[PDB]
Design a protein around this ligand. Sequence first.
Ligand SMILES: Nc1ncnc2c1ncn2[C@@H]1O[C@@H]2COP(=O)(O)O[C@H]2[C@H]1O
Ligand SMILES: Nc1ncnc2c1ncn2[C@@H]1O[C@@H]2COP(=O)(O)O[C@H]2[C@H]1O
Ligand SMILES: [Mg+2]
Lengths: 214, 213
Amino acid sequence: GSPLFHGLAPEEVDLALSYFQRRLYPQGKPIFYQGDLGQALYLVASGKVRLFRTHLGGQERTLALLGPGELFGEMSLLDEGERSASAVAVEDTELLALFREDYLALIRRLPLVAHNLAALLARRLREADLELDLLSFEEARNRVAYALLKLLRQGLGPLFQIRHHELAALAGTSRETVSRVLHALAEEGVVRLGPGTVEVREAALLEEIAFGLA
Amino acid sequence: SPLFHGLAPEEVDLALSYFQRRLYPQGKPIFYQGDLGQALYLVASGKVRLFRTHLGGQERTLALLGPGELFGEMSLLDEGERSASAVAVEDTELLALFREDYLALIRRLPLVAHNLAALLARRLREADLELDLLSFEEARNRVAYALLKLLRQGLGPLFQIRHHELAALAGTSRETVSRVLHALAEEGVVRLGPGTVEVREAALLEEIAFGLA
Ligand SMILES: Nc1ncnc2c1ncn2[C@@H]1O[C@@H]2COP(=O)(O)O[C@H]2[C@H]1O
Ligand SMILES: Nc1ncnc2c1ncn2[C@@H]1O[C@@H]2COP(=O)(O)O[C@H]2[C@H]1O
Ligand SMILES: [Mg+2]
């Protein structure tokens, strides 16, 4: 069941599908490219589609693998801007295409289709905010160790009155990952934790961990 | 207001009747990040600052919005949290559209829902452009970190090293490394030659390696 059709009665789904046109793309055929003039969105009826952007001397960053029921190409449909990504068939693929003029007449009968596009884009923007904030545990570990190292280097230590959040601000990670890292560092016997305190036990081992050789 | 793009003048009037006026004197919070929002807003008068909390308790400012501009559409659409905080920076008048009234409105003026999808489409374009940049930014930290490790393993400050060697060390591609190295060189952090990378500014390099500079 396509999210584009969420909320619609069975008859209304049938109604909506009647505005679409069938388009076929064999394995490995480009559907469209980033920067192309676009006048339609696509539902995947069968097969598999890959979306990707190109940058950095022609390198590709994959954004999505889409199977049956999934939607793409709605941005050029909506704003008449160029395609924001390339789309290639990775299997023999059947696409149901909805052109801009047919879309305009459809939402006049079923506004919930326009709203469903809005919601999908909202879902995607949320996934994008997450990708901004994301970092591997391993690198988080180095960065948190380095932050602790920085406190060691003020010449007092090795016991610190410090909240996980102040350490997170120091390291540039979230409070949650700082706690995750500190619990792993305590399990390794590198630090000892208490109510509002972090005590470094193994400073040399910590310094090793900060610089990623441990 | 672009939310009403394409509407006849009497349709704009009809659309505006679904909104509700809310007043916010200067410095008053309109909503916080994490709130379960039930409405989107238009600025009728005044000025709103949108800002997001980015790890540690700090706030990146997203925009300053004046008359005619729209915000708070996310929670309206998906019923999830506000992804930013909004505060009045002047005495402000807002037109608010609650979810049940939004649903009734687009049933009557479908172009409004279209105009909203179109706007989110513009923001997603901007976001992809930013995410292209994130790949490179993360690469720049990881490349710095790789060189930093060579420096701390005793080597340097001049390294005999090929780009592909660095790429293996940093978990990136050769092309990206070449680009990262060119930027660090313009930043004065390293100096390059045939098969060589020289660290000029070890402390700066260290900061870059941990995502601090
Ligand atoms: N960040 C993203 N995540 C998932 N899909 C996207 C993203 N950005 C663009 N797309 C899709 O890729 C399509 C490429 O062409 P369009 O811009 O017409 O519409 C685009 C969206 O359907
Ligand atoms: N990156 C961004 N750029 C511009 N505006 C944004 C950005 N992120 C969030 N917003 C706006 O800030 C609002 C805060 O509440 P919502 O998430 O409901 O809807 C959000 C958008 O209107
Ligand atoms: Mg009402």
